[PDB]
């Protein structure tokens, strides 16, 4: 079984991160939802207080790895080929290329996709799902599985909602109905509205481990 | 894994069945929310006077898009795709059993929203259309060259929103042409309808060129 084998490696990964005092976050989303830009902003705001590392996973991982690196983060690129999602196996090897005693926060950018990364625990402490208004306001209700795995649901690009005809209150209500336990934040990474709430989720999650 | 060899056999059988009944089929792929359904809706509205049109709508919860296509006057077979990140020829083959192919001229299949998995899975269609949009970012085409190479038409949709996301549409258009020199590349807005003429052109040309 592939799912049993993943959970095994996820717990192993999580055990290793805890040993070295690292708090890890899994950033999932659709394609272009805003994962990298969110991580970029988080690095800029948190790097004074925390030592931050990133794992950037995509077909061509260099695009986002380089985007993260310039913000002052240690970054491990992971070329994911035709895989729909990152897994605890690939993440485990990425952790071997990190000095976890010189790192406090780990931001993992998962492959852009709303089906597959649901079911694949990477060994992180929290999971963030970033969707955007430009995907249409049915995007949350159309993908309940992944939404239920989220600790934070980010509804990004609120500044473009009217232009696509997206109802952001519908999206907010959909997220809360499908996952009552998750935090839900309305965000624009352009205007920065709602960014303080995402930052707060990160900071609290770290202190709660 | 022998998955792709078995799929190809079924895809060829699907194409033969479609050709037998004079149906031209189109596989609509893309990212999440790129505009596949809205494009299909617009195509139905503008071609239904000339062609009898059927759709296959595949997604986790297929009803959302099936219901949209239904109100535009197409016969729709919904496919609830579960955790699968692509449709395949097998499921499409069985969907074809629910259609009267002697009363259909065009088949529009909306694949699941994913730029990775559908690349390797031929559905048994005549043409493949990849819809991406400016709001996903202007690196989207060069970040996923695999699926782009499988496209006969590449649609760069939501051009009306490019400035608001900082996307360079000229860059994206060049990315698409360079990665797939054989594909048609269309800049589109389904809001203003600019570029729609070129999509219709592709559909009609494809129909005329079959076999
Ligand atoms: N207008 C506006 N644009 C945004 C917002 N958030 C992200 N974007 C834009 O969306 C595009 C995609 O953002 P990006 O950060 O690259 O997404 P991503 O999820 O990481 O994309 P991926 O390829 O790895 S799957 C970029 O052009 C970025 O500027 C927002 O809140 N408002
Ligand atoms: N402004 C603008 N909005 C568009 C354009 N094309 C589509 N949209 C909007 O984008 C959103 C997504 O469109 P939709 O047709 O549902 O995408 P889809 O690709 O079929 O989405 P999916 O859930 O099946 S994966 C909708 O809100 C729609 O109104 C466009 O060209 N310009
Ligand atoms: Mg990214
Ligand atoms: Mg759709
Ligand atoms: Zn290994
Ligand atoms: Zn069968």
Q: Output the domain CATH number for residue B114.
A: 3.40.50.300
Q: Are the C-beta atoms of A53 and A106 separated by less than 8 Å? A: yes
Q: Residue A132 pairs with which residues in a beta bridge?
A: A156
SS3 content of chain B, % helix, strand, coil (to 5): 45, 20, 35
Report chain A's C-alpha Rg in angstroms.
16
Q: How far apart are CA A70 and CA B188, in angstroms?
A: 34
Q: Cβ contacts of residue B1 below 8 Å, gap of 6+? A: none
Closest-CA residue of A relative to B118 is A82
- In this structure, chain A runs to a length of 209
Cα B2 from chain centroid (whole Å): 25
Count of domains for chain A: 1
Write a three-state SS string for A80-98: CCCCCCCCHHHHHHHHHCC
Q: Cβ contacts of residue B8 below 8 Å, gap of 6+? A: B89, B122
Backbone region of residue B99 per phi and psi (left: phi > 0; alpha: psi in -120 to 50; beta: other values): beta
List helix spans (H) across chain A: 2-19, 35-46, 62-69, 88-96, 144-148, 161-164, 168-178, 195-207
Question: Nearest Cα to A89, choosing from A185, A3, A175, A148?
Answer: A3
Phi/psi for A169 (5° steps) reads -75, -35
Q: How far apart are CA B192 and CA B62, in angstroms?
A: 27
Mutation probe of ligand 1 site: the residue of A54, A168, A185, A189 with most atoms within 8 A of C-beta: A189
Decide: helix, strand or coil at residue A127. Answer: strand
Question: Is A66 near chain B, with CB under 8 Å?
Answer: no
CB contact under 8 A, B60 and A143: yes
Q: Residue B26 pairs with which residues in a beta bridge?
A: B108, B127
Chain B residue numbers with beta carbons less than 8 Å from the beta carbon of A58 are 143
Phi/psi for A144 (5° steps) reads -65, -35
Boundaries of domain holding A54: 1-209
List helix spans (H) across chain B: 3-20, 36-47, 63-70, 89-96, 145-148, 162-165, 169-179, 196-209
Residue A136 is classified by DSSP as: -
Q: Are the C-beta atoms of B142 and B115 separated by less than 8 Å? A: no
Report chain B's C-alpha Rg in angstroms.
16
Q: Is B55 annotated as a binding residue?
A: no
Question: Is A160 near chain B, with CB under 8 Å?
Answer: yes
Structural method: X-ray
Q: How far apart are CA A108 and CA B139, in angstroms?
A: 20
Chain B residue numbers with beta carbons less than 8 Å from the beta carbon of A63 are 139, 143
Mutation probe of ligand 2 site: the residue of B59, B162, B190 with most atoms within 8 A of C-beta: B190
Burial status of residue B51 (CB atoms within 10 A of its CB: 0-12, 13-18, 19 or more): middle
Q: Please count the other Cβ atoms lying within 10 Å of the Cβ belonging to residue A112.
A: 31
Q: How far apart are CA B32 and CA B150, in angstroms?
A: 18
* Chain interruptions in chain B, by residue before each (C–N > 2.5 Å): none
Question: Is B135 near chain A, with CB under 8 Å?
Answer: yes
Q: How far apart are CA A131 and CA A128, in angstroms?
A: 10
Question: In this structure, which ligand is nearest to the CA of B93?
Answer: 6
Q: How far apart are CA B141 and CA A73, in angstroms?
A: 26
Question: Is A110 near chain B, with CB under 8 Å?
Answer: no
Q: How far apart are CA A206 and CA A178, in angstroms?
A: 25
Q: Residue A75 pairs with which residues in a beta bridge?
A: A54
The rounded Å distance from CA A15 to ligand 5 centre is: 18
Q: Are strands A23-29 and A105-109 parallel, antiparallel or unpaired?
A: parallel
Q: Are the C-beta atoms of A158 and A122 separated by less than 8 Å? A: no
Closest-CA residue of B relative to A134 is B135
Buried b (16+ CB within 10 A) or exposed e, A22-53: bbbbbbbbbbbbbbbbbbbbbbebbeeebbbb
CB contact under 8 A, B64 and A134: no
Question: Nearest Cα to B87, choosing from B53, B62, B52?
Answer: B62
* Residue ID of nearest Cα to ligand 2 atom 13: B35
Q: How far apart are CA A204 and CA A191, in angstroms?
A: 23
CA dihedral A115, A118, A119, A120 (to 10 degrees): 100
SS3 content of chain A, % helix, strand, coil (to 5): 40, 20, 40
């Amino acid at each position: 079984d592939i799912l049993k084998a993943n959970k095994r490696l996820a717990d192993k990964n999580r055990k290793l991160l805890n040993k070295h005092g690292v708090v890890a976050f899994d950033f999932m989303g659709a394609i272009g939802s805003g994962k990298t830009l969110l991580i970029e902003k988080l690095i800029d705001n948190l790097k004074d207080k925390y030592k931050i590392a990133c794992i950037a996973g995509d077909v061509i991982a260099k695009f986002d790895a380089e985007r993260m690196e310039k913000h002052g983060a240690k970054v491990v690129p992971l070329n994911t080929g035709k895989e729909c999602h990152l897994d605890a196996h690939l993440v485990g090897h990425a952790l071997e290329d990190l000095n976890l005693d010189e790192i406090d926060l780990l931001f993992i950018e998962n492959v852009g996709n709303l089906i597959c990364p649901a079911d694949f625990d990477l060994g992180t402490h929290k999971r963030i799902v970033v969707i955007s208004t430009t995907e249409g306001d049915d995007t949350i209700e159309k993908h309940p599985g992944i939404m239920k795995t989220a600790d934070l649901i980010v509804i990004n690009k609120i500044d473009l909602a009217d232009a696509v005809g997206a109802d952001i209150k519908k999206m907010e209500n959909d997220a809360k109905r499908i996952n009552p336990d998750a935090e839900v934040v309305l965000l624009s990474l352009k205007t920065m509205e709602g960014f303080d709430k995402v930052l707060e989720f990160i900071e609290k999650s770290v202190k709660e481990v």
